Amino acid sequence: KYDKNDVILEVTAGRTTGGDICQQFTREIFDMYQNYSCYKHWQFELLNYTPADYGGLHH
RNA sequence: CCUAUAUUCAAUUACACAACCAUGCAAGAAGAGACAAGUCGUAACAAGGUAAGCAUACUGGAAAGUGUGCUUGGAUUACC
Numbered sequence: 738k739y740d741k742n743d744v745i746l747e748v749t750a751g752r753t754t755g756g757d758i759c760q761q762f763t764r765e766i767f768d769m770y771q772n773y774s775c776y777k778h779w780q781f782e783l784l785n786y787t788p789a790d791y792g793g794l795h796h
Numbered sequence: 797c798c799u800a801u802a803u804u805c806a807a808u809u810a811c812a813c814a815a816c817c818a819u820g821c822a823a824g825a826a827g828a829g830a831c832a833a834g835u836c837g838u839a840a841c842a843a844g845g846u847a848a849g850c851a852u853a854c855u856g857g858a859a860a861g862u863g864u865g866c867u868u869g870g871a872u873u874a875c876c
């Protein structure tokens with residue numbers, strides 16, 4: 738079923754450790770899927786992008 | 797009633813009678829604790845950058861802010 742509906746991918750910053758170790762890691766995997774979409778010839782549409790203070794992605 | 801002995805007895809009345817408390821459930825309200833790292837600010841510990849704090853009053857998103865009196869669980873480094 739489905740497989741022909743646009744899918745929204747949401748990434749956040751896990752709350753398990755202090756610092757930016759989790760926030761910085763969020764940026765890397767977010768760009769992983771963005772480059773992956775080009776490999777699969779998909780279409781990427783940015784909806785929300787909130788950078789963190791210490792060079793990261795809050796959500 | 798010349799030895800002797802037989803028989804009966806009841807429940808009513810005036811008024812109170814779920815107030816009351818226990819247990820269980822509930823439309824819903826409020827508090828406390830928890831890890832965790834999110835948003836907002838930096839109150840406290842150094843004269844914490846306005847010395848802190850108690851009683852009480854008033855005020856503000858939030859720590860708290862300010863007045864009056866009191867405490868040193870602050871200092872004035874000591875022929876200055």
Ligand SMILES: [K+]
Pocket residue numbers: none
């Ligand atoms: K103060």
Ligand SMILES: [K+]
Pocket residue numbers: 847848870
């Ligand atoms: K002090």
Ligand SMILES: [Mg+2]
Pocket residue numbers: 755833
């Ligand atoms: Mg922290």
Ligand SMILES: [Mg+2]
Pocket residue numbers: 843845
């Ligand atoms: Mg000073």
Ligand SMILES: [Mg+2]
Pocket residue numbers: 844
């Ligand atoms: Mg301070």
Ligand SMILES: [Mg+2]
Pocket residue numbers: none
């Ligand atoms: Mg200040």
Ligand SMILES: [Mg+2]
Pocket residue numbers: 846
């Ligand atoms: Mg102060």
Ligand SMILES: [Mg+2]
Pocket residue numbers: none
């Ligand atoms: Mg004071």
Ligand SMILES: [Mg+2]
Pocket residue numbers: none
């Ligand atoms: Mg007071």
Ligand SMILES: [Mg+2]
Pocket residue numbers: 861862
């Ligand atoms: Mg004032």
Ligand SMILES: [Mg+2]
Pocket residue numbers: none
């Ligand atoms: Mg005062």
Ligand SMILES: [Mg+2]
Pocket residue numbers: none
């Ligand atoms: Mg004034």
Ligand SMILES: [Mg+2]
Pocket residue numbers: 873
């Ligand atoms: Mg001395």
